[PDB]
Amino acid sequence: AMVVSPAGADRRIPTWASRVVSGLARDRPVVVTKEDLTQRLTEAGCGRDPDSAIRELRRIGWLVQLPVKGTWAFIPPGEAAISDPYLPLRSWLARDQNAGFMLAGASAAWHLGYLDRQPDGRIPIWLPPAKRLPDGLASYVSVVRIPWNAADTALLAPRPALLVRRRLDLVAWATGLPALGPEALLVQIATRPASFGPWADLVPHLDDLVADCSDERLERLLSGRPTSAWQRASYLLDSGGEPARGQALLAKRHTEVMPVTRFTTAHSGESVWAPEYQLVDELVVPLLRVIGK
Ligand code: NA
Predict the structure, then answer these.
(1) What separation in Å is there between the alpha carbon of 287 and the centre of ligand 1?
(2) 120 and 212 co-located in one domain
(3) Cα of 46 to ligand 1 centre, how many Å?
(4) 23 lies in the same domain as 116
(5) Which of residues 77, 98, 119 is at a domain's end?
(6) How close is the Cα of 25 to the center of ligand 1, in Å?
(7) What residue stretch is flagged as signal peptide (predicted)?
(8) Are 69 and 9 in contact (CB under 8 A)?
């Protein structure tokens, strides 16, 4: 959630650093790169080694190292911390504007409005097959790796018209980062239910999610997924109160024969049988049952 100055709110400013800190205080960059700090030192008439300058600024609490190499957060005067849970990802974009990730799973669901509680923990993202996660980020992010076409991000992102209808800001609804829309979210959690954490937080709001999904987008995002994903996605439509849509979606799958599938994050509670989708539900209805009690 927060990046905290180890020095507390009241930080000394050595004279050598006065213009550097004042410039960062005026400009308030989201992330400070090593190159940005190097240039600001030079501009200040400061001939300090950049690494040395940063080490001291770190020690005294003005810069806090971020997970991606060569990035820092500036903690502004008068503040003890920054409240921004996505600074690890912004630090990645600071080094690589083509990072190519999208907020996924619980983060996407949270900003789309399907969760009771703000999720915490590692930030769930989707990355295309071809993109590697920088090593510094593994402790901060969990990656879901469904081989969607990275070229068609219009498919992955929510429909702008949906954002407008939902009173979400066209650009800042997920705090300015790229994020999966409801269709890609639903397909993600149907394809790999274990990739999604707060199921109990989501399941009361399936009606809300399902009402926001276009079935054509669902179908194109399911194209190439295993049949089980289609079964589970169609059952989610049913569970969100749209059995006719669920059965129609399931009828558009590529493979005719439909093995029985489990809807579970880890098979071992109670279960419901949905023959329409050849699905044993160990998750959605069983959670709804615990929640009602
Ligand atoms: Na909705």
Answers:
(1) 21
(2) yes
(3) 55
(4) no
(5) 98
(6) 40
(7) none
(8) no
**Cα–Cα distance measured from residue 37 to residue 112, given in angstroms and rounded to the nearest whole number:** 36
Based on the fold, state whether residues 105 and 75 are members of the same structural domain: no
163 shares its domain with 292: yes
Distances in Å between the alpha carbon of 269 and those of 233, 272, 275, 286, 292? 22, 11, 20, 7, 15
| 157 and 37, same domain (yes or no) | no
CA atoms within 13 A on the CB side of 186: 37
Domain of residue 256 covers: 99-293
Task: Give yes or no: residues 144 and 182 share one domain.
Answer: yes
CB atoms within 10 A of CB 251: 9
CA of 205 to the centre of ligand 1 (A): 9
Resolution, given in Å to one decimal, reads: 1.9
Q: Work out the number of other CB atoms within 10 angstroms of the CB of residue 264.
A: 18
Q: Which pair of tokens denotes residue 263?
A: 């809807």
Neighbours of ion ligand 1 (CB under 5 A): 208, 211-212
DSSP H stretches of helix in the chain:
18-27, 34-43, 50-60, 87-95, 105-112, 153-156, 160-165, 182-191, 199-202, 206-211, 215-222, 227-239, 243-250, 284-292
Judge contact between 57 and 63, C-beta under 8 A.
yes
Among the candidates 98, 127, 144, a domain finishes at 98
